[model samples]
Target: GDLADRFAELERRYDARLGVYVPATGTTAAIEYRADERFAFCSTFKAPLVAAVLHQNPLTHLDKLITYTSDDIRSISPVAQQHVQTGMTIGQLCDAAIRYSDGTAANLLLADLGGPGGGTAAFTGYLRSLGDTVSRLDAEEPELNRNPPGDERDTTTPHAIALVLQQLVLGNALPPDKRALLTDWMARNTTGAKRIRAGFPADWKVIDKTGTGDYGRANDIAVVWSPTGVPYVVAVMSDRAGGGYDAEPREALLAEAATCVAGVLA
Candidate 1:
């Protein structure tokens, strides 16, 4: 209740809408504000895409190579653009997708699974297998972020995403090695400094992914550990009320919510 009110206050102060879910940390119960509300996955889905690849082939997926061309490249592909001619290992693409938020790398991985409807379907199915009923992805990057108000496609509830993150990182969904690998990638994330990480304590260990895009969306999903070694699954998603593709964005508001959660958790 305290955490929920804090999040609500953050939303009011920032004049932004929010969906936050912080699963229990130690004896604390989960805290949620609009945790059931839907928001597009945007780039945050990249981490899960890599996770799904591992789920399909945990033993050799990382060692395998995926090739692509200039045509495969799309917007915000800083890492993948460098390797268009040479191709990359699945491990490298995972790094690109999660560490650098490489759009092209994400698309290539999605295609490797099954493009568009097929890959997206497989992904949504994975969510279902993870006990996540409210999250779904209909397409790959850019298009997946269309995020119209009424359309629920390519969207996930804060609680569903949080549960999925927890299941992968701290639950039995993946083996210890695979789970460690996923968390390692998240621990080294290149973005999210001013978002959820902003509110995280200096000594706490956090594995996180950030998503940004249309409709003023700014999202960060993470598993954070206290110095005492308690882990909490936190998903913070925010969006402005009205916008088209690429609005003003809501990183500041998201950070506020994270700060509030950090305090409550403490």
Candidate 2:
């Protein structure tokens, strides 16, 4: 397929590990010069958590309400610090998580939704309802671990993450309006755009989510809408790559590869 060759070329050019998945038509393709592996969720887990809340809540439209506390304000995550001791509705938090890639907002959202147990239950229920059963959520605090006990990391395959993105675009995980709201946020994402977002035409509409962390890890999942209304989901997970303003060649290579894939499909 076109996607397969394009993906391979990107991988070869960048000299980085890569995976590509399109879930709209149940098409899954990848190029992993390393191993067929999975990566840590990082902040990308926020996407499903947002879907879970929307699944349980029936609010047709979102309102800006006061929902942050002093603790919430003091959060080190950029989004949390901005909203400290202030009011922000669920809608705003959700947007913050996607738009700014706000880790604090994601942490707060998980807490407000009743922690990992609650978020996991809701996420799982919604996935099952949508006929998506490939992904799973575990203990939410991989970053919060102080002792580094146990695995201290949450893992998900690129294929599974792509499926979740598929559900998000198809409006299977949440109500149509809410799903659209999040999708809009994803499309408007600015962080790490040079990599995954770089592949498409300037006019093409694409919604994407990205996760980055220590240890040279980078992950991105995105949906591109062609002029014909055909949408494709692509998920990529990599480690030890570097790019963007940081001048990490490996990460930059990863982004280049993703952009190549997106460019081909777009």
Candidate 3:
């Protein structure tokens, strides 16, 4: 509650964008006094896609090689622009998706699973089976996942995603092995480390997934591990700023905010 109070005061002064949620055993805590109710989920949708693909076929090896022609690689700008002739195995792509939040890797996996339209549908189906019906994916061409049509791309509440994450961590969402892989990937996610990972002690084991779009929209979902191995799930989503906003500073704020919350609950 002290951290929440600090964030409330900061929000009042700066009117900055923020979203937060911290769940315990008996009851859950949440905070979201941002610009609007709509929160865009840029690349954060990749989290579910990764889960669906791994669940659909656990034998899919990440080490198997996959090629990318000019068109196949076109959706990814940074990679495509830099390494035109390079190719990567599925494992490498997974690492890339977590490390760089590589657009190319996400679409590549999306296409390998099925294009965005089909992929989105598959992901949505998985969500429904899990009882997380509030999340929705907007279909778009397979070129690049620059948000979907219909004004909003993937939209979800902090509470909804936090619940899904809880399911994942509590072994209710994916199979045990697959769930382990999901959490491992989340642990390796490098996007919002400075923000979400900042709250914990250096020794604390934190697994997190994050998404940032061209606009100020951002989201981070994480499961923090205590020294005794007890875990907690949190998801935060916000869109207080528009396109071309910086995520590092906002991430730092969120990390500090969550760290304060986790210190108490942990």
Candidate 4:
């Protein structure tokens, strides 16, 4: 319960609810607190959304070029904005979403697997296909970031998302080649640099997806490999009461938790 004490102090320090899940890895006991609780996924949903896209056809489908116009560009869409004229291959969209959290790129790809309404229903169905029932997305990025108090839309549990992350990363969720592709894209993610990545040893192989939303919601889910090659899946999510969180403190809290999560090796 050492982690419990540290996590409690963190909650008190930041006045935020912290939900974490780190499955048993090697000799380490599973470390969980509020793991079953729900929290908004925000942009982290893009990671699983890309996984759903890969589930259909991880091979040739990636090469499919989906064209776009200037109207499709949205805020925080550096990758999509830069490539507007040429359009992006499906794989490039994947990189844009996963690597850059490009909202526009996620929608371009979601337009396919999301069925009608462009991600209102089928994406939730995709989660169901993976044995995940609690995670749901009723809207796309930007709009989906509207995490209203007590509303469960676009929400996921630390435990649930950790399972999804585990399957996508170290399990047989997708073919090895495509899984390798996912791993590579995630490993090179330009986001999450100061969140979970800051907590681990610089040399350790760490891959993560981050999320931010209203009401101080900030989250990161990751898989970190020890020097001996043991992979550990950890999901860290937090939300405080009313006034949204500050970046300096938000990243600090998530980073401090990552520091603790990285030390649980037995």
Among all candidates shown, the one with the greatest TM-score: 1
Write candidate 3's Cα lDDT for 1-266 as tens digits: 36657767655543455667665565444443332345666666667767776776755676667678666554444543355476877766666666567777776776667664576666677777778777776553222234432254567667666777778767567888878777777777777777667778766687887776544555677887778776777666654453234423256556666766666766
Clashes of 3: 7
- Weakest lDDT window of 10 consecutive positions for candidate 2: 144-153
- Report every candidate's CA lDDT: 0.84, 0.62, 0.64, 0.84
TM-score of each: 0.95, 0.76, 0.81, 0.94
Weakest lDDT window of 10 consecutive positions for candidate 1: 240-249
Q: What is the full ranking by TM-score, best candidate first?
A: 1, 4, 3, 2
Clashes of each: 0, 8, 7, 0
The reply for model 4, stretches above 4 Å from the true place, is 116-118, 244-249
Q: lDDT of model 2 at residue 224?
A: 72
Query: What's model 2's overall lDDT?
Result: 0.62
For model 2, which pairs clash? Answer: 66-87, 73-84, 241-251, 242-248, 242-250, 242-251, 242-252, 243-252
Cα lDDT of model 1 by residue, 136-254, tens digit:
88877768866686689999989989989988999989888888888899999959888888888888777899998778888999888888988898899988756555567878887
Residue pairs of candidate 4 with colliding backbone atoms:
none
Q: Which stretches of candidate 3 lie over 4 Å from their true place?
A: 1-5, 26-36, 61-64, 74-86, 139-152, 242-249
Candidate 2 segments exceeding 4 Å error:
1-16, 24-36, 64-66, 73-76, 115-117, 120-134, 139-152, 241-251, 263-266
